Amino acid sequence: VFRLGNAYLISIDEIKAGQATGRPLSTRKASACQLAHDQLVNRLVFKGSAPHK
Amino acid sequence: YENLFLRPACPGNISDTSTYNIDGACVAQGDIGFGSAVQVVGIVDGVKVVAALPDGGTPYGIAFRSQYEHLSGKILDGEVCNVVSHGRVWTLTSLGEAPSLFSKLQFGSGGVVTGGSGSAGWTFAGGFVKHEDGYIIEVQVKQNAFIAPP
Amino acid sequence: HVGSFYNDNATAKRIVDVIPEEMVTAGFKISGVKDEKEFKSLWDSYKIDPSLVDALCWARLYGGAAIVAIINDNRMLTSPVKPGAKLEGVRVYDRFAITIEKRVTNARSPRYGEPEIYKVSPGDNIQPYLIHHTRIFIADGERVTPQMRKQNQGWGASVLNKSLIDAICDYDYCESLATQILRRKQQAVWKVKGLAEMCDDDDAQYAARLRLAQVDDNSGVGRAIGIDAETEEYDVLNSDISGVPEFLSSKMDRIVSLSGIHEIIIKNKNVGGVSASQNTALETFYKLVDRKREEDYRPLLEFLLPFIVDEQEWSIEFEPLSVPSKKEESEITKNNVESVTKAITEQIIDLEEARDTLRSIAPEFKLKDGN
Amino acid sequence: SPKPFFMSDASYHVGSFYNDNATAKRIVDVIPEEMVTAGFKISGVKDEKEFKSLWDSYKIDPSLVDALCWARLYGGAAIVAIINDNRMLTSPVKPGAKLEGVRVYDRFAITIEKRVTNARSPRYGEPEIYKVSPGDNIQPYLIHHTRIFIADGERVTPQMRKQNQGWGASVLNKSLIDAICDYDYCESLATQILRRKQQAVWKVKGLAEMCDDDDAQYAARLRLAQVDDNSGVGRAIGIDAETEEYDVLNSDISGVPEFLSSKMDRIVSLSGIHEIIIKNKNVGGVSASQNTALETFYKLVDRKREEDYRPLLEFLLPFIVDEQEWSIEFEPLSVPSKKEESEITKNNVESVTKAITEQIIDLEEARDTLRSIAPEFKLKDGN
Amino acid sequence: ASYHVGSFYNDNATAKRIVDVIPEEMVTAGFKISGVKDEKEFKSLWDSYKIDPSLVDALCWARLYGGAAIVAIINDNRMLTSPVKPGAKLEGVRVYDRFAITIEKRVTNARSPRYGEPEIYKVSPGDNIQPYLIHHTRIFIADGERVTPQMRKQNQGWGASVLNKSLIDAICDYDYCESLATQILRRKQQAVWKVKGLAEMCDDDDAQYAARLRLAQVDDNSGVGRAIGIDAETEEYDVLNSDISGVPEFLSSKMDRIVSLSGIHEIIIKNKNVGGVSASQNTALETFYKLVDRKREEDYRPLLEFLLPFIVDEQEWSIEFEPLSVPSKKEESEITKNNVESVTKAITEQIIDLEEARDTLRSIAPEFKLKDGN
C-alpha cells in the first residue's frame, strides 16, 4: 500500500481580493488537488510505475 | 509572497525575517561585544565555547543582541550566549565607504569588517548606515561558507 | 460598487440596516383566529424572521429581492397551487438571480402584463430552474419614475443615491484634512550659511540630518538649543485652529438631513440640553417607521399568512410602537380595569363579554378560558 | 440643445431631478404617502368589518400612492378602473357595485379624443372619450369618461391652464429648483475653503532656470514631496540661508456653519414643510415645542388633503358600496399614546353612563354611543 | 493597514469594550419561560448546569470572527455521529470558533428542505487530540451580521467582523492625535542661545563637553525668583513661545466620530455623564435598551430554541423576554400596591375567583411568596 500527497499556496492579499463571479480561488485550488489525486490514482492503475514495482 | 522587514536598526540585531538560525547553546570565554564575529575554540558536552575572533581564525557567527541574557551591555565571561549562524545581521565595521553589492567581506581582528575583496565567505547585503562616528553594515551569513583549515 | 460601500463602510450599513430589522422586530397581531398561543407556537417553530430581515435589507439595498416558499404538496413546483394552508420552508434570493421567462397577456384575466413564470438561477453548480408565479413573492425598494421603472425591468431603485454617496464620501476627506491641519500646527525652520553647497548623499549630509534629528528630539520646555550666531538661525512659525468642530457638525447635519434619519439614531448622541425632547424625536421616528412599514411589510403578511391559517376571515393589526414601562403600564392596567367594570353593573354588558374585552386588551392578568 | 430622440420629453429634466437628488424625493413624496396611509372611515354603512376586509382584499392603496405621487410631480395623472360588466369597454357604465382592477398611468400617456359641447347638458366643454397610449407594443385604445378619474396638481392662472391643456403645474418650480441647486455649490465652496486654510511657499533663487520635464526637475519635485511629507510638529526642516526661503501663509474660517444654516432656512421657507420634517433635526433647546410644530404640520397636511384625497374617494366608493347614502370622514391625524387613550377611555365611559340612567337613553343606544368612538372595548352584537 | 483582529482584541481596551459590551449584558439580563408546571426546579437545573459563561464567549467569538459553533454532548448510548432520538437529557456544551469548524459532507437531496445546509461538520480542535465529525442536529451555528451574498459565498457562508476597516482606522488615528497633543504641549516654549563663533569649536572634545555641561547646569536653575547673566557683546539668549487652543474640542470631535461609527453612545462608551441635565440619561439608556433588545431578538433567541428542547420534557412552551429595566424599591413597592389592588378591587362580582386570582398575582414577579394550594 502506498501514500499520495501534494499542497498548494495562497496569499492573504488574494484572499481579501474578490472577483465578479464564479467560485473563489481558494475553492478552485482545493478542487484542483482532489482532481490531481484522482487522476494519479487512475494513472497508477492503468500505467504502473517501474521504480516503485 | 514576500518577506517583511524588521524596524529597529541597531548593531547586533537581525535586519530581516528571512531564513535565519540562532545557536543558543554556547558559552563565552573572555568578553564579547554585540555585533562581532566569534570563533569556536572547543566543545564540551554538546556546548560550544566561543571567543572573539583572533588573527588566523575562521569566523563562525555573529553575537546577537538580547535584553534579558545580557543586562550589562555586552556579553561577559561565563555567560550563555546567542550566536547567529545563518541570516542577515548588522555588523560593526571600520570601513569608510560601502563596498560593491554582493562582494566578499573580510574580517579584521576583534571581529570587525575591514575588507571587501575576499575569496570566499560571507557577502555584503546592501545596507550601510552610520553609528557613533563609525559605521554599521549588513552581512549575509551562511552556514557552511567558511571551512576550518585542516 | 454599492455592494462595496455596504460591506465596507459602516455609516451606509446603518443607513440601510436600522429600519428593516427594528421594523420587523416591533411585532404584530392577527385577528379572527380562535387563539394566539398556538399561532405563536407555529410562528416561532417556523422561525423564518431573520431570513425575512435579510430579504428586506437586500430589497432596500439593490432595489429588489425575491422570496420563495415551498409548500407541502404532491405536485411539481412548476404547476400552480391548490387551496390549502401548508408550507415547509422559505428561502431568499437577491436582485441578480431572478428573471422573466414567458408572458401572459390574455385580455380576460386581470393578470395580463404580469409575470407568470420566473427563472431563478442561484448558481451553486445547480441548474437554474423555473417557478410559477403563485409560489414566490417579489419585493421592491423605493419608487422611481415609470420611464426608469420600465428601463430597470420593472424593479425598484437603490436607497443609496449618488447625492447620498458623495455626501458620505466628503466627510472622510474633511476628516483627513482636519488631521493634517492638526499636524501642521507648528513648524520649525533652520537656516545655515552655505548649507546648499553640501553634496548629496554623503557622510556629511547623513551626519547633518542625524544631528538635526537628535537636536530636535531633545527640544522642549526644560531644554535649550544653542546655535552659532553669525551663520545659522533657528526660527519657529505657527498657525491657529478654530471652528473645525462646527464645520464637522455641519457636514454631519447635511448627512442627517439628506438621509432622513435623525441625530439620536444616526449620530446616536443625546443632546443633553433638554431632558424630555428626545422622546418626541423618537416618536417622530416611530411615525416615519410605521409610515414606511405600512407600505412594504404588510404585503409580506398577506402573502405568508394565507398559507398557514385555515380560518376563513382574518385581519392584521400593527402593535403600537411605543417603548413600554412597568410603572405606566401598571397604572394603565388600573385605569383600564376600573373602566371595564365600573359602570357595566347596570346594563346588559355581562361577564361573557367583559372577560373577552379584558383578555383582548393584553394584560399581565392571565386567566383560564371559561364562562 | 439637441437631445436623444427617444428621450426628448419634459421627463428628461424633472424626471432626472426627482430620480437623482434626495431632497426633491422627500419634497415630492412625504405628503401624499403619509396623506393616504393616515386612512379614512365611513358612516351610513351597516358594518365596517367586511368593508375593511374587501378594502384590503383589493389592496390598491400602493397604486393610489404613486398615482398621487405622479399627479404631484408631473402635474397630472390618470387612473383606469375595470369593472365586471358584460359590455365593450368603450360604452358607459350601468349602475352597480363591482371591481376587477385599477391601474394608474402618468400625464404623458393620456390624450383627449371626443369632446362634447352640447348646451342641454352642463357636461359641455370637457373631453368625453380619451386616447390612452401606454405603449409596450400594444394598441392604444379608447376609454369613456365615466370610468376614469384624472388627478391634477397645483392651481395655475387660467391663461396657463388653457395652454397646459387643462393640466396643472409641477410643484418643483424654478425658484425652488435653483434654491436647491446653489446649495451644492455652497458645500463645494465650503470644502475648498477648508482645503485652502494654510499654504506653504518654497522660494529658490535660480529655480526658474531649471529645464522643464527632465530628470533634474523630477528629482527636485521628488525631494520637495519627500520633505513635505516628513514635516510636522515633532520634526523640522533645514534650508540654505543664501538661496532659499520657506514661508507659510494662513487664513481664518468662521461663520460658514450659520451661513449654510441660513441657506437651509431659505430652502424650508420656499418648500413650505418645516424643519423637524425636512431637516429631521429637533431644536434641542426646548422640551415640547416640536409637538406644536407637528400639529401645525398636521393642519397643513389636512388642509391639502381636503382638496385632493376626497375626490378620489367619491370617485371610487360608489363602484363598491351597495349602500345607498354614505358619508366619508377623516380620523383626527394625531399619534395617540397608551396612557392618553387609557384616560380618554376612562372619561368616555364615565360620560356615556354617568347620567343617562335618569333619561330615556336606554342601553340599545348607549351602546352605540360608546362603541361608535372606536374603543379597545370589543363588543358583541346584540341588544 | 488592517491586522489580525485577535491582535486588537487583547491589546486595545476600546476594542475590548466595543465587542464585549452588548453580549455580556444581553445574556446577564436573563429570560422567562411559559407553559412549564413550575420554575424553582427550572432555576435549579439552570444554575446546576451553569453554562452561561460558555454561552457568553460563544456569542463573543461569533461576533468577533464572524462565526462560531457549539457542540452539545448528550447522555445517549450511541455514537455521536449518529442522529438523535427525542429526549430531554444533556451533560455538557462546549464552543469552538470559526477556525476549527468546516463542512465535511454535502447533502442536497431534493425532497428534504435540508438541502443547502451541510449534514456533517469537521471539527479540528487540536491539543494533540484527533479531529472528529459531527451530525447536523447536534450543533448550532451562529454568525455575525448580514453581508452581501457575494461575500457570503466567498466567506463560505460566514459573516464579517464588526471591526470593519473604517472603524479600525477611526480608532487608530485617535491615539495618533493624542501623541500629537502631547508633542504640542511639550513644544509650547523653546529657548535659543547664540554665541559668536560657536561653530568653530570642533566636536567630541572636552571643550564641547564642558560647554554642554555648563548649558545643562545653567538651564536647570532658571525660574521666577532667579536671574540669568549673559555677555552683551558676544552672545544673546532669546525665548520663543506658542499657544495651545481647541485641542480638547478637537479630541472630543474625534470621540464623536468614534461613537457615531460604533453605534453605542457616550454614557456607555465614554462613561461621562453630560452633567447639564438631571434626567436625560434615563432616555439615553432606554434608547440603548431598545437597540440591545432589537439585536438580542435576532441572535440570542435561536440559541434558546436550540437548547431548550434538550432540557425540557414538557411538550409545549414559549419564551418571553423580561422588560429590560432595573427596578427601584420605592417604585416597585408602589407598583406592587397598584397591581395588587387592581387584581383584587373589582373581581368580587364576576366569575373571576381565587384559584385564578392567585395565579394572576403570581404572574407578576412578586416579593409576596405564597405556598401552592387551593
GROMACS .gro file of N, CA and C in nm, chain A residues 15 18-20 22 24 26, chain E residues 2 4 150-151 153-154 156:
model
   42
   15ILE      N    1  -0.674   3.639  -0.091
   15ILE     CA    2  -0.793   3.600  -0.016
   15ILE      C    3  -0.888   3.719  -0.001
   18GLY      N    4  -1.146   4.017  -0.429
   18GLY     CA    5  -1.265   3.950  -0.478
   18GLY      C    6  -1.276   3.950  -0.629
   19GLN      N    7  -1.358   3.861  -0.683
   19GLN     CA    8  -1.383   3.853  -0.826
   19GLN      C    9  -1.532   3.874  -0.850
   20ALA      N   10  -1.565   3.909  -0.975
   20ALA     CA   11  -1.703   3.945  -1.008
   20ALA      C   12  -1.797   3.827  -0.988
   22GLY      N   13  -1.821   3.352  -1.011
   22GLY     CA   14  -1.754   3.223  -1.015
   22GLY      C   15  -1.712   3.176  -0.877
   24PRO      N   16  -1.467   3.089  -0.568
   24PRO     CA   17  -1.347   3.158  -0.519
   24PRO      C   18  -1.220   3.081  -0.552
   26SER      N   19  -0.976   3.005  -0.361
   26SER     CA   20  -0.947   2.902  -0.263
   26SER      C   21  -1.020   2.772  -0.296
  959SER      N   22  -0.501   4.700   0.798
  959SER     CA   23  -0.567   4.608   0.889
  959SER      C   24  -0.473   4.494   0.928
  961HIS      N   25  -0.452   4.128   1.217
  961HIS     CA   26  -0.535   4.025   1.277
  961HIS      C   27  -0.620   4.084   1.388
 1107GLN      N   28  -2.265   3.787  -0.234
 1107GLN     CA   29  -2.138   3.758  -0.300
 1107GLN      C   30  -2.026   3.735  -0.200
 1108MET      N   31  -2.019   3.816  -0.094
 1108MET     CA   32  -1.925   3.791   0.014
 1108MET      C   33  -1.967   3.676   0.104
 1110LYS      N   34  -2.100   3.395   0.000
 1110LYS     CA   35  -2.049   3.276  -0.067
 1110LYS      C   36  -1.896   3.272  -0.065
 1111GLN      N   37  -1.831   3.388  -0.079
 1111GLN     CA   38  -1.686   3.392  -0.077
 1111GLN      C   39  -1.628   3.352   0.058
 1113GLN      N   40  -1.752   3.134   0.251
 1113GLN     CA   41  -1.806   3.002   0.280
 1113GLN      C   42  -1.920   3.009   0.381
   0.00000   0.00000   0.00000
